[PDB]
Write an enzyme that holds these catalytic residues in place. Structure first.
Site, PDB file in Angstrom:
ATOM      1  N   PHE A   7      -5.605   5.829  -0.310  1.00  8.69           N
ATOM      2  CA  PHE A   7      -4.735   4.757  -0.389  1.00  8.69           C
ATOM      3  C   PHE A   7      -4.714   4.235  -1.821  1.00  8.69           C
ATOM      4  O   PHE A   7      -5.683   3.953  -2.337  1.00  8.69           O
ATOM      5  CB  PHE A   7      -4.941   3.559   0.536  1.00  8.69           C
ATOM      6  CG  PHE A   7      -4.625   3.869   1.891  1.00  8.69           C
ATOM      7  CD1 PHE A   7      -5.619   4.601   2.748  1.00  8.69           C
ATOM      8  CD2 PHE A   7      -3.412   3.658   2.603  1.00  8.69           C
ATOM      9  CE1 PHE A   7      -5.590   4.663   4.230  1.00  8.69           C
ATOM     10  CE2 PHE A   7      -3.507   3.879   3.949  1.00  8.69           C
ATOM     11  CZ  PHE A   7      -4.136   4.222   4.718  1.00  8.69           C
ATOM     12  N   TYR A  40       0.921  -1.029   0.089  1.00 16.41           N
ATOM     13  CA  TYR A  40       0.112  -0.090  -0.138  1.00 16.41           C
ATOM     14  C   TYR A  40       0.700   1.272  -0.061  1.00 16.41           C
ATOM     15  O   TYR A  40       1.962   1.189   0.416  1.00 16.41           O
ATOM     16  CB  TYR A  40      -1.096  -0.182   1.245  1.00 16.41           C
ATOM     17  CG  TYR A  40      -0.435   0.056   2.374  1.00 16.41           C
ATOM     18  CD1 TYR A  40      -0.319   1.459   2.923  1.00 16.41           C
ATOM     19  CD2 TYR A  40       0.045  -0.668   3.474  1.00 16.41           C
ATOM     20  CE1 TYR A  40       0.453   1.917   4.450  1.00 16.41           C
ATOM     21  CE2 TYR A  40       0.793  -0.661   4.561  1.00 16.41           C
ATOM     22  CZ  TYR A  40       0.602   0.571   5.033  1.00 16.41           C
ATOM     23  OH  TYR A  40       1.354   0.820   6.352  1.00 16.41           O
ATOM     24  N   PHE A  66       2.638  10.828   4.373  1.00 16.27           N
ATOM     25  CA  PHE A  66       2.577   9.683   3.327  1.00 16.27           C
ATOM     26  C   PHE A  66       3.390   8.435   4.037  1.00 16.27           C
ATOM     27  O   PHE A  66       4.550   8.586   4.731  1.00 16.27           O
ATOM     28  CB  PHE A  66       3.341  10.044   2.056  1.00 16.27           C
ATOM     29  CG  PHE A  66       3.549   8.859   1.101  1.00 16.27           C
ATOM     30  CD1 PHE A  66       4.461   8.099   1.242  1.00 16.27           C
ATOM     31  CD2 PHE A  66       3.043   8.940   0.004  1.00 16.27           C
ATOM     32  CE1 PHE A  66       4.895   6.975   0.298  1.00 16.27           C
ATOM     33  CE2 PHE A  66       2.913   7.654  -1.032  1.00 16.27           C
ATOM     34  CZ  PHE A  66       3.913   6.853  -0.952  1.00 16.27           C
ATOM     35  N   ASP A  67       2.946   7.119   3.686  1.00 15.96           N
ATOM     36  CA  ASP A  67       3.691   6.020   4.453  1.00 15.96           C
ATOM     37  C   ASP A  67       3.350   4.989   3.190  1.00 15.96           C
ATOM     38  O   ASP A  67       2.206   5.028   2.716  1.00 15.96           O
ATOM     39  CB  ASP A  67       3.144   5.714   5.572  1.00 15.96           C
ATOM     40  CG  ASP A  67       3.605   4.196   6.195  1.00 15.96           C
ATOM     41  OD1 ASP A  67       4.933   4.147   6.466  1.00 15.96           O
ATOM     42  OD2 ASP A  67       2.570   3.375   6.213  1.00 15.96           O
ATOM     43  N   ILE A  88      -8.642   0.003   9.920  1.00 12.54           N
ATOM     44  CA  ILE A  88      -9.752   0.917   9.870  1.00 12.54           C
ATOM     45  C   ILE A  88     -10.781   0.284   8.921  1.00 12.54           C
ATOM     46  O   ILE A  88     -10.582  -0.271   8.126  1.00 12.54           O
ATOM     47  CB  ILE A  88      -9.448   2.142   9.168  1.00 12.54           C
ATOM     48  CG1 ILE A  88      -8.435   2.175   8.091  1.00 12.54           C
ATOM     49  CG2 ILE A  88      -8.534   3.045  10.398  1.00 12.54           C
ATOM     50  CD1 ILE A  88      -8.448   3.392   7.317  1.00 12.54           C
ATOM     51  N   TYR A 113     -10.518   7.698  11.085  1.00 14.66           N
ATOM     52  CA  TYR A 113      -9.753   8.041  12.391  1.00 14.66           C
ATOM     53  C   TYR A 113     -10.761   8.780  12.947  1.00 14.66           C
ATOM     54  O   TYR A 113     -10.438   9.441  13.999  1.00 14.66           O
ATOM     55  CB  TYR A 113      -8.439   8.443  12.149  1.00 14.66           C
ATOM     56  CG  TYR A 113      -7.315   7.570  12.073  1.00 14.66           C
ATOM     57  CD1 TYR A 113      -6.950   6.641  12.963  1.00 14.66           C
ATOM     58  CD2 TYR A 113      -6.976   7.165  10.588  1.00 14.66           C
ATOM     59  CE1 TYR A 113      -6.103   5.573  12.725  1.00 14.66           C
ATOM     60  CE2 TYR A 113      -6.132   6.209  10.313  1.00 14.66           C
ATOM     61  CZ  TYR A 113      -5.561   5.244  11.261  1.00 14.66           C
ATOM     62  OH  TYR A 113      -4.648   4.508  11.108  1.00 14.66           O
TER      63      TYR A 113
HETATM   64  C1  LIG Z   1     -10.988  -1.321  13.964  1.00  9.98           C
HETATM   65  O1  LIG Z   1     -10.553   0.254  13.621  1.00  9.98           O
HETATM   66  C2  LIG Z   1      -9.054   0.392  13.640  1.00  9.98           C
HETATM   67  C3  LIG Z   1      -7.969  -0.880  13.772  1.00  9.98           C
HETATM   68  C4  LIG Z   1      -6.805  -0.389  13.828  1.00  9.98           C
HETATM   69  C5  LIG Z   1      -6.213   0.869  13.975  1.00  9.98           C
HETATM   70  C6  LIG Z   1      -5.051   1.156  14.028  1.00  9.98           C
HETATM   71  C7  LIG Z   1      -4.361   1.666  12.883  1.00  9.98           C
HETATM   72  C8  LIG Z   1      -4.172   0.639  11.723  1.00  9.98           C
HETATM   73  O2  LIG Z   1      -3.854   1.333  10.554  1.00  9.98           O
HETATM   74  C9  LIG Z   1      -4.891   1.031   9.514  1.00  9.98           C
HETATM   75  O3  LIG Z   1      -5.974   0.439   9.640  1.00  9.98           O
HETATM   76  C10 LIG Z   1      -4.342   1.665   8.253  1.00  9.98           C
HETATM   77  C11 LIG Z   1      -4.693   0.631   6.890  1.00  9.98           C
HETATM   78  C12 LIG Z   1      -3.493  -0.410   7.104  1.00  9.98           C
HETATM   79  C13 LIG Z   1      -2.249   0.454   6.958  1.00  9.98           C
HETATM   80  C14 LIG Z   1      -1.997   1.002   7.955  1.00  9.98           C
HETATM   81  N1  LIG Z   1      -3.029   2.177   8.111  1.00  9.98           N
HETATM   82  C15 LIG Z   1      -2.869   3.449   8.430  1.00  9.98           C
HETATM   83  O4  LIG Z   1      -4.128   4.391   8.563  1.00  9.98           O
HETATM   84  C16 LIG Z   1      -1.568   4.119   8.201  1.00  9.98           C
HETATM   85  C17 LIG Z   1      -1.542   5.234   7.451  1.00  9.98           C
HETATM   86  C18 LIG Z   1      -0.603   5.585   6.399  1.00  9.98           C
HETATM   87  C19 LIG Z   1      -0.660   6.650   5.705  1.00  9.98           C
HETATM   88  C20 LIG Z   1      -1.880   7.401   6.251  1.00  9.98           C
HETATM   89 CL1  LIG Z   1      -2.243   8.954   5.585  1.00  9.98          CL
HETATM   90  S1  LIG Z   1      -2.596   6.697   7.504  1.00  9.98           S
HETATM   91  C21 LIG Z   1      -1.196   4.471   9.632  1.00  9.98           C
HETATM   92  C22 LIG Z   1       0.350   5.288   9.566  1.00  9.98           C
HETATM   93  C23 LIG Z   1       0.917   5.695  11.014  1.00  9.98           C
HETATM   94  C24 LIG Z   1       0.842   4.292  11.666  1.00  9.98           C
HETATM   95  C25 LIG Z   1      -0.568   3.930  11.875  1.00  9.98           C
HETATM   96  C26 LIG Z   1      -0.955   3.402  10.514  1.00  9.98           C
HETATM   97  C27 LIG Z   1      -3.342  -0.545  11.775  1.00  9.98           C
HETATM   98  C28 LIG Z   1      -3.447  -1.787  11.751  1.00  9.98           C
HETATM   99  C29 LIG Z   1      -2.642  -2.839  11.786  1.00  9.98           C
HETATM  100  C30 LIG Z   1      -1.139  -2.349  12.085  1.00  9.98           C
HETATM  101  C31 LIG Z   1      -0.982  -1.160  12.223  1.00  9.98           C
HETATM  102  O5  LIG Z   1       0.467  -0.691  12.253  1.00  9.98           O
HETATM  103  C32 LIG Z   1       1.459  -1.706  12.366  1.00  9.98           C
HETATM  104  C33 LIG Z   1       1.615  -2.475  13.755  1.00  9.98           C
HETATM  105  O6  LIG Z   1       0.756  -2.233  14.550  1.00  9.98           O
HETATM  106  O7  LIG Z   1       2.278  -3.629  13.714  1.00  9.98           O
HETATM  107  C34 LIG Z   1      -1.762  -0.132  12.064  1.00  9.98           C
HETATM  108  C35 LIG Z   1      -7.197   1.838  14.033  1.00  9.98           C
HETATM  109  C36 LIG Z   1      -8.535   1.429  13.914  1.00  9.98           C
HETATM  110  O8  LIG Z   1      -9.413   2.543  13.845  1.00  9.98           O
HETATM  111  C37 LIG Z   1      -9.057   3.858  14.188  1.00  9.98           C
END
Ligand SMILES: COc1ccc(CC[C@@H](OC(=O)[C@@H]2CCCCN2C(=O)[C@@H](c2ccc(Cl)s2)C2CCCCC2)c2cccc(OCC(=O)O)c2)cc1OC
Length: 128
Positions: free
Chosen positions: A118, A45, A55-56, A75, A101
């Protein structure tokens, strides 16, 4: 940009049809199969804010991002969007904060009420 293209041309894939998750297929995937609830999914992604500047990318490793589909491990927009994807598909998703978020955000990186974009490549998926 790709975000405005999703605004203008994206398909609303939310059950409520509230435009909270909009999708463009950028590369078509293979066959017809899409993942089941509970399937381990493997993606690359690139993500970024629309409003602000962040950005990531998973390609920051030669290691796919993996989660269990439909279990609230990611999310809401990802549970919704990845469920619709075929193996090898690339899609763009534009996501309103309700499906990400929300008002809390994720400070400091992600402000309150942030729209996210994304690009997701579904590499593979497999059951437990
Ligand atoms: C059920 O609702 C949720 C579930 C999980 C989360 C946490 C954020 C959750 O992040 C995500 O769901 C999304 C989609 C999957 C890739 C990461 N995601 C992000 O937003 C990432 C983004 C990058 C660029 C952006 Cl503009 S936002 C975000 C970047 C900084 C770290 C947090 C992840 C997450 C899931 C699993 C692993 C993870 O980071 C690595 C680790 O922990 O090993 C982070 C938030 C939720 O709601 C706010």
């Amino acid at each position: 940009g790709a975000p405005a293209t999703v605004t203008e041309q994206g398909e609303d894939i939310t059950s409520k049809k509230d435009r909270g998750v909009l999708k463009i297929v950028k590369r078509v995937g293979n066959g017809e199969e899409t993942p089941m609830i509970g399937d381990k999914v493997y993606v690359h992604y690139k993500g970024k804010l629309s409003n602000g500047k962040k950005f990531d990318s998973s390609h920051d490793r030669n290691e796919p991002f993996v989660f269990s589909l439909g279990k609230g491990q990611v999310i809401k927009a990802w549970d919704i969007g990845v469920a619709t994807m075929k193996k090898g598909e690339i899609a763009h998703l534009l996501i309103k904060p309700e499906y990400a978020y929300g008002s809390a955000g994720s400070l400091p990186k992600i402000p309150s009420n942030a729209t996210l974009f994304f690009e997701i490549e579904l590499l593979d998926f497999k059951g437990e």
